[PDB]
Design a protein around this ligand. Structure first.
Ligand code: F3S
Ligand code: ZN
Ligand code: ZN
Lengths: 66, 86, 196, 258, 176, 98, 90, 113, 122
C-alpha cells in the first residue's frame, strides 16, 4: 500500500528516498544513476524502490466509514 | 523329532526365554499394581525417574518380581517360568 | 473472397475437403465455435505491411479496422484444415496461407505470468496455475467498502522484477499478490529438506 | 594488537583488526546487532484513526522509525534493570481539510527534546479528505535480541584480510575481477585496491600463473553501518561492554560453586 | 497398561526393520547422502578447530587420537573422524553407489574410493552414499550394524553421525 | 511449493562480503529431479534487474535481454557473472569453502 | 543467565547455560581451545528455538576443567578490555 | 498432420513430437506443445486397493502363532504345521534369509581377508 | 624397520579433483607411490629424499611429511612380486616389493605404522 520504512533484508531506511527517486525517474532520469546518487548501493535496497506499487493513492477514495 | 525338528528347535529355544508380549504384560501389570499403593521391591531413592513404569522396568531387569508365567501348550501340557531371580 | 470483402458475414467459415473418395464443401455459420485470428498472407507476403503498422502505432486504426479491411480473419477449427500457418515472418513460403500474430498466445492468462516457461518441465507449469489462484494480495481497490464472506489482504505487495508482457495488460502490476525475496540456494541446518 | 582505520564515511565505519581471534571479532559483530540499547516505540494509545491504515499497521510503522538515542543511554533505565526515567512520550495529532495530505516524521512531537526522529522526511501515512489521526506513543530502551526494531545497525560484516600479489602480467585480471582490484598502468598489471579483494578467486581460473591470492591469518576487516540512532564508534564500545557484563556474571556464578 | 504397552511394543527404534522384507525402513535421505560422500571422500582434510566444530553437534566427548597427517601441518581426515563411531570389531567389504561407471574396479585396489573397506571399525577405503546409509537398502553396512549390535545402537548411530553430515555441508557449502 | 520449517534471525543467517542476507533459503536438492531451470534464470534476471534498474522481459520465446548479456552487465556492475557470492557463517564468522 | 552442572569430574565438565547463545558459546570454545592442558572443548546449542547452550570440556588432569573455563573467561575479558581501550583512540 | 504449422502427410521427427533442444536451451512453441501433450497422462495419476486390503484383513485376522510353533486359528483349525518353513520372522530375517553365512564369515575373519 | 634412499619420478593428478600421486623409484627394486593434496604438496619431480616405515614415532620437523595409518592389504602377483598398501586413514601408500612386508616377517596384518618422508637436501 505505502512504502515500507525499512528494507526487508537489512535494516536500512528506504521510505525517505521514495519521493525523490520517483519524482526524478518520472522526470526522465536514469533509475540506476538516481539510485547511486541517493546512496542506495545494495540490490536488496534497490529492489525495495524498483518494485513498490503506490496503492494508498487509489485506496483513499474507498476508505471504510466507521 | 516329535512332529518335526523345527518344532523341537522352537520349543527348546523358547524354553528359558521371555517373549516381548510377556515382558510387556509383566511390566504393565506391575506398573498398574504399583500405582495402586504397592511397595517397590527396589531402593527407589537414586533412580533417574520416579514414575511407576520406570520402577517396574527396573524391578524386572533385576529379578525381584515374584511373578510366574503360565504357558499352556495346545495339547494341554503346562510350562511354568519364574522371573524371580530366574 | 466475399467474406474478406465485406459482402458476407464474418461468422461464416468454409472448408473444402478433397480425398481419394470424398469431394465435399462445408459451410458453418452457427454459434459456439471457438475461433482464433490469423494474418492473411498472399504469395508469401502478409497483408499487414509497414504503413498499416505505422498507422496502428499512432492510434489511427485498431485491430477491428484490420479485421474489417480483410487483413486478419477469425477461422474455426474446420476451416483451419486448409490452412498452412507460419510461426515467424522469416520462414514464409509462397505455399503459406496464414501467419501467426503472437506465438505466445497459445497460453492462458495464468500461464502468461510464468517467467521462462519453456525452460521448465510441463507438470510444474501445470501446478503453478493451481497455486497462483490461492495467493494473497490486493483483490480490489475498494475492498474496504465491500462485504465479502472471507477476504485477505497482503500488507506490502510488490510487483515482480522479472516481468512478462501480459502482466501489464491484465492489470496485475496494480493488483499484485506477492513480493520479491532475496533467495539463496544452499543446504543450511537441515530445515529446508524435502519441500521445506 | 592494534586497530587501523580504513574509512569513515557518514554512517559507515571500516577497521582493520590485528592479533585478535576470529571468535572475538565475530562476537563483537553479533553483539553490535543484539546487545546495544536503542529508543523505539513500545506501544501506541489511539484516540481516533480514520486513515486507510489500521491501528496495528500504523503502530508497526511508528515502531520502525529510528530515534536519536545518544543522550538517552545515561538518562534512561536500560531493559536489563526494569513511569519517569523509563519511558518517553511522543504525540501526533493531524487532520486533512479538503484534499489528500501526507503525514511525515516532522509531525511527531516529543516531550523530551533530545529524543527526536533521525529524519523528518519519512512518510508515515497518507490521509484522505476530512480524515484525522490523534495518538500517543511511549518510547523505551531495548535490545535487538528482543525485537529487531531495537537494532542500531543495518549491516555488520567481518571478512578475511586479503593478500594480492602480481607475479607476471595479464590483461584478463582487470576484465574478470568484480571488485576492481587491478588496473593497467603503463602496460603492466598493478594492484590498486588490495583491501577491496573479497577472495573470489575468479582471477585464478584465468590468470592462473600471473596472480597469487592468499589471506593473512592474524588480520580481519570489520564493517558496520549505523542506522542513525547511535554513532558507529559508540556501538562498538557498547557491544564490548555487554560482552564484559555477561562474562563477569558467568565468572561470578562459576566461582560461587567451588 | 496402555502406556506401558505402547512404550514396550510400539516405540520407533524397535521398528527400524520392516516386516515386509528384512530391511531397514529408516535411514538417510538427501543432504545426508551428499554430506556423507563429501565428508568421507579421501581428499577431505580437517584441522583441530574444524574437527571440534563437527563433533560439537554430537554426544562425543573424549580423545581424538593423533591426527592422520602430522607434518608439514597437523590434519585430520574425514574417514578418521567417521571411524570414531564404528564398533571396534566391525568388518565390512562392499562396493559404493558411485561405482556404477568406469571407476568400478570390483576389488580393494581402487583409486576412486569406489570400494568400501572397514576393518576392526576403521574406515580405510571407500565413501558413504545411498548404498551404505540410505533407507530401504537391504544388506547394507547400516543394516548389518543394526542387525549385529541392536536397534539401540542404530538409534544412537542415527542420532549422532547423521548430524555430522549436515554440519559438514554447512561448513563446505553446497549449491546449484 | 513448500512449508516454512524454521525462522532464523539476521545474525544467524549467512552473509556475503557486502553484508547481504537471504530472505529465503532453498534446498539445492529440489531442483535436479524437477528440472525447473526457469527459477534459476529468474533469480539471475532479478539480480540483474535490481542492479541495473532496467526492465526485464521473460516472455516465452522472446526474452530480452538474453542471459549472456545479463551476466556481462552483472559483472560490469560489481558482481560475479554466474550470480554466486562469497559467504561467511553468521554463527562462527568463518568463510564457506564454496 | 542460569547455569547447572550435568556431569563434573576433575578432568571433565558438562555445563548447561540458560539464556545464552552462539555469541558466548563460540567465544568460550575458542578461548578454551588455546588454554594449555585442555584436550577437547566444544559447545552445543541443543535446539535453535531455545536460548540455551551446553559446554563440554576435557583436560589431561594437569588443570581442572572449571579452572580452564575460568582462565578462558579471563582471556576473553582481557581481549574485550583491550578492544574498548583501542576503539576510543581511532 | 498434428498441427497447422506442418505440411499434409509429413511424418518427419519434428512433425510428430521429437524435441531436439534441452531445458537449458529452451523449447520451441510446437516443442512446448508436444512436451505438454506427452505429460498430460501423468496428471490423472485406490478403492480397489482398499477393498483388497480389507478383504485380506477380514480373511486373515484370526491367525496366531502358538507355543507349539504351529499356525492355528482362534477356533482351533490348523493352517501350517510350522510357520513358514523354518519358523523365522521376516522382520528378523537377513533379507529373507534366516542366516547369511557369508556375513558370518566376514564377521569372524574379515579383518585379515 | 624399513628405510631407504630414493628419487621422485613423477607427480600426476589422479582420479579426484585435488588428489595428486607421487611416484618414486627406490633401491633394492622397490617402488613407492602415495596420495597427497595441495596442502601437503612439498615435493619436486626430480629430488632425492629418504623414507622410513616403522611402528614407533620417528623424529620429524615442519619441513617433512609424516603420517600414521594401518597396513591392511598384501597381494602376490604372477611374477612373484608383492603389492602392499598402507592406508593413512584414507590416503593410500602403495609399495612394490619382491618379498613383501608381511611375507618377509617385517610387519603383521593390520599393524599401526608411521610413514615419514624427509628431503635429502637438509
Ligand atoms: S577475481 Fe576478484 S576479488 Fe579477490 S581473489 Fe580473484 S580478486
Ligand atoms: Zn537492504
Ligand atoms: Zn576404481
Amino acid at each position: 500500500m505505502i512504502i515500507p520504512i525499512r528494507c526487508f533484508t537489512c535494516g536500512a531506511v528506504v521510505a525517505d528516498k521514495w519521493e525523490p527517486f520517483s519524482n526524478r525517474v518520472m522526470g526522465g532520469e536514469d533509475p540506476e544513476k538516481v539510485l547511486t546518487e541517493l546512496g542506495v548501493n545494495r540490490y536488496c535496497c534497490r529492489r525495495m524502490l524498483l518494485s513498490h506499487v503506490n496503492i494508498i493513492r487509489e485506496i483513499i477514495h474507498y476508505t471504510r466509514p466507521i | 523329532m516329535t512332529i518335526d525338528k523345527i518344532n523341537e528347535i522352537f520349543k527348546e529355544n523358547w524354553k528359558n526365554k521371555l517373549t516381548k508380549y510377556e515382558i510387556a504384560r509383566i511390566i504393565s501389570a506391575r506398573a498398574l499394581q504399583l500405582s495402586m499403593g504397592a511397595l517397590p521391591l527396589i531402593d527407589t531413592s537414586n533412580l533417574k525417574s520416579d514414575d511407576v513404569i520406570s520402577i517396574a522396568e527396573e524391578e524386572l531387569k533385576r529379578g525381584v518380581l515374584p511373578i510366574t508365567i503360565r504357558r499352556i501348550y495346545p495339547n494341554g501340557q503346562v510350562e511354568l517360568i519364574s522371573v524371580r531371580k530366574i | 473472397e466475399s467474406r474478406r470483402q465485406g459482402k458476407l458475414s464474418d461468422e461464416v467459415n468454409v472448408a473444402y475437403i478433397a480425398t481419394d473418395y470424398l469431394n465435399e464443401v462445408h459451410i458453418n455459420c452457427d454459434a459456439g465455435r471457438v475461433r482464433r485470428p490469423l494474418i492473411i498472407v498472399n504469395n508469401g507476403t502478409p497483408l499487414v505491411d509497414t504503413e498499416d503498422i505505422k498507422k496502428l502505432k499512432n492510434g489511427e486504426i485498431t485491430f477491428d479496422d484490420l479485421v474489417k479491411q480483410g487483413k486478419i480473419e477469425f477461422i474455426d477449427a474446420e476451416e483451419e484444415e486448409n490452412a498452412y500457418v507460419a510461426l515467424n515472418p522469416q520462414d514464409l513460403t509462397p505455399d503459406h496461407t496464414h501467419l501467426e500474430i503472437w506465438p505466445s498466445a497459445i497460453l492462458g492468462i495464468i500461464a502468461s505470468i510464468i517467467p521462462y516457461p519453456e525452460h521448465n518441465q510441463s507438470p510444474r507449469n501445470t501446478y503453478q496455475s493451481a497455486m497462483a489462484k490461492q495467493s494473497l494480495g490486493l483483490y480490489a481497490s475498494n475492498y474496504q467498502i465491500r462485504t465479502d464472506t472471507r477476504a485477505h489482504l497482503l500488507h506490502y505487495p510488490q510487483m515482480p522484477l522479472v516481468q512478462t508482457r501480459m502482466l501489464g495488460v491484465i492489470g496485475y502490476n496494480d493488483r499484485p499478490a506477492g513480493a520479491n525475496a532475496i533467495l539463496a540456494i544452499m543446504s543450511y541446518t537441515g530445515y529446508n529438506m524435502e519441500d521445506s | 594488537m592494534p586497530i587501523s582505520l580504513i574509512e569513515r564515511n557518514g554512517l559507515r565505519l571500516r577497521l582493520v583488526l590485528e592479533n585478535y581471534p576470529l571468535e572475538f571479532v565475530n562476537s563483537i559483530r553479533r553483539a553490535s546487532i543484539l546487545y546495544v540499547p536503542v529508543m523505539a516505540v513500545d506501544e501506541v494509545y489511539f484516540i481516533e484513526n480514520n486513515s486507510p491504515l489500521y491501528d496495528e499497521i500504523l503502530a508497526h510503522r511508528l515502531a520502525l522509525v529510528p530515534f536519536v538515542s545518544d543522550e538517552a543511554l545515561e538518562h534512561y533505565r536500560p531493559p536489563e534493570e526494569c513511569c519517569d526515567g523509563c519511558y518517553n512520550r511522543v504525540y501526533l495529532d493531524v487532520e486533512a481539510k479538503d484534499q489528500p495530505l501526507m503525514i511525515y516524521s516532522r509531525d511527531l512531537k516529543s516531550e523530551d527534546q533530545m529524543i527526536t526522529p533521525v529524519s523528518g522526511a519519512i512518510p508515515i501515512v497518507l490521509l484522505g479528505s476530512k480524515q484525522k489521526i490523534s495518538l500517543e506513543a511511549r518510547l523505551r530502551l531495548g535490545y535487538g535480541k528482543e525485537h529487531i526494531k531495537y537494532s542500531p545497525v543495518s549491516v555488520s560484516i567481518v571478512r578475511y584480510y586479503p593478500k594480492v600479489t602480481v607475479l607476471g602480467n595479464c590483461e584478463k585480471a582487470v576484465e574478470v575481477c568484480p571488485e576492481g582490484v587491478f588496473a593497467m598502468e603503463n602496460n603492466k598489471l598493478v594492484v590498486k585496491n588490495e583491501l577491496s579483494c573479497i577472495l573470489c578467486e575468479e582471477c585464478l581460473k584465468y590468470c592462473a600463473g600471473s596472480v597469487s591470492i592468499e589471506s593473512v591469518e592474524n588480520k580481519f576487516i570489520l564493517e558496520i553501518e549505523s542506522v542513525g540512532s547511535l554513532k558507529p564508534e559508540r556501538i562498538l564500545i557498547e557491544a564490548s561492554k555487554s560482552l564484559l557484563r555477561k562474562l563477569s556474571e558467568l565468572k561470578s556464578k562459576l566461582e560461587a560453586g567451588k | 497398561e496402555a502406556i506401558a504397552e505402547a512404550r514396550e511394543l510400539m516405540l520407533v527404534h524397535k521398528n527400524i526393520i520392516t516386516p515386509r522384507y528384512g530391511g531397514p525402513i529408516i535411514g538417510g535421505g538427501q543432504d545426508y547422502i551428499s554430506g556423507a560422500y563429501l565428508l568421507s571422500v579421501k581428499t577431505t582434510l580437517l584441522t583441530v578447530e574444524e574437527v571440534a566444530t563437527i563433533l560439537g553437534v554430537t554426544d562425543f566427548v573424549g580423545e581424538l587420537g593423533e591426527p592422520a597427517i602430522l607434518a608439514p601441518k597437523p590434519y585430520y581426515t574425514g574417514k578418521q573422524v567417521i571411524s570414531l563411531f564404528l564398533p571396534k570389531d566391525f568388518n565390512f567389504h562392499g562396493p559404493a553407489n558411485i561405482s556404477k561407471g568406469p571407476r568400478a574396479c570390483k576389488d580393494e585396489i581402487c583409486p576412486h574410493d569406489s570400494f568400501i573397506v572397514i576393518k576392526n571399525g576403521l574406515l580405510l577405503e571407500g565413501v558413504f552414499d545411498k548404498k551404505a546409509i540410505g533407507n530401504q537398502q537391504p544388506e547394507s553396512m547400516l543394516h548389518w550394524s543394526i542387525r549385529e549390535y541392536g536397534t539401540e545402537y542404530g538409534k544412537w548411530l542415527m542420532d549422532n553421525v547423521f548430524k555430522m553430515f549436515i554440519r559438514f555441508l554447512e561448513m563446505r557449502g553446497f549449491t546449484m | 511449493k513448500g512449508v516454512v520449517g524454521i525462522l532464523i534471525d539476521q545474525v544467524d543467517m549467512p552473509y556475503t562480503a557486502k553484508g547481504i542476507v537471504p530472505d529465503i533459503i532453498l534446498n539445492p536438492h529440489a531442483l535436479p529431479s524437477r528440472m525447473t531451470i526457469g527459477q534459476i534464470m529468474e533469480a539471475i534476471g532479478g539480480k540483474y534487474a535490481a542492479l541495473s534498474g532496467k526492465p526485464v522481459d521473460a516472455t516465452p520465446f522472446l526474452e530480452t535481454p538474453k542471459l549472456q548479456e545479463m551476466q556481462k552487465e552483472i559483472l560490469k556492475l560489481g558482481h560475479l557473472p554466474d550470480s554466486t557470492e562469497v559467504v561467511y557463517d553468521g554463527r562462527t564468522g568463518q568463510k564457506l569453502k564454496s | 543467565m542460569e547455569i547447572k552442572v550435568i556431569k563434573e569430574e576433575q578432568n571433565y565438565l558438562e555445563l548447561q547455560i540458560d539464556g545464552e547463545e552462539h555469541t558466548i558459546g563460540n567465544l568460550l570454545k575458542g578461548m578454551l581451545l588455546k588454554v594449555p592442558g585442555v584436550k577437547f572443548a566444544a559447545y552445543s546449542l541443543p535446539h535453535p528455538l531455545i536460548t540455551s547452550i551446553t559446554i563440554k570440556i576435557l583436560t589431561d588432569g594437569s588443570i581442572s576443567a572449571r579452572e580452564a573455563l575460568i582462565k578462558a573467561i579471563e582471556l576473553a575479558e582481557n581481549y574485550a578490555n583491550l578492544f574498548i581501550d583501542e576503539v576510543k583512540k581511532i | 498432420r498434428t498441427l497447422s504449422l506442418f505440411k499434409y502427410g509429413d511424418i518427419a521427427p519434428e512433425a510428430r513430437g521429437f524435441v531436439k533442444n534441452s531445458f537449458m536451451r529452451g523449447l520451441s512453441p510446437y516443442e512446448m506443445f508436444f512436451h505438454a501433450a506427452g505429460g498430460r497422462e501423468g496428471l490423472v495419476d485406490t478403492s480397489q486397493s482398499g477393498y483388497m486390503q480389507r478383504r485380506l484383513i477380514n480373511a486373515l485376522s484370526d491367525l496366531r502363532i502358538e507355543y507349539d510353533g504351529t499356525v492355528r486359528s482362534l477356533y482351533g483349525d490348523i493352517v501350517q504345521v510350522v510357520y513358514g518353513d523354518d519358523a523365522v520372522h521376516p522382520m528378523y530375517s537377513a533379507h529373507s534369509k534366516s542366516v547369511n553365512v557369508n556375513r558370518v564369515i566376514e564377521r569372524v575373519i574379515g579383518w585379515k581377508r | 624397520m624399513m628405510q631407504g634412499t630414493c628419487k621422485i619420478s613423477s607427480i600426476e593428478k589422479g582420479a579426484l579433483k585435488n588428489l595428486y600421486v607421487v611416484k618414486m623409484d627406490c633401491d633394492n627394486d622397490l617402488k613407492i607411490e602415495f596420495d597427497i593434496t595441495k596442502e601437503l604438496s612439498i615435493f619436486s619431480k626430480d629430488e632425492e629424499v629418504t623414507f622410513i616405515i616403522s611402528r614407533e614415532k620417528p623424529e620429524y620437523s615442519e619441513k617433512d611429511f609424516c603420517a600414521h595409518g594401518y597396513l591392511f592389504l598384501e597381494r602376490q602377483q604372477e611374477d612373484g612380486s608383492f603389492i602392499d598398501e598402507i592406508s593413512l586413514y584414507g590416503l593410500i601408500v602403495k609399495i612394490l616389493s619382491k618379498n613383501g612386508l608381511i611375507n618377509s616377517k617385517l610387519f603383521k596384518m593390520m599393524d599401526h605404522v608411521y610413514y615419514c618422508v624427509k628431503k635429502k637436501a637438509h
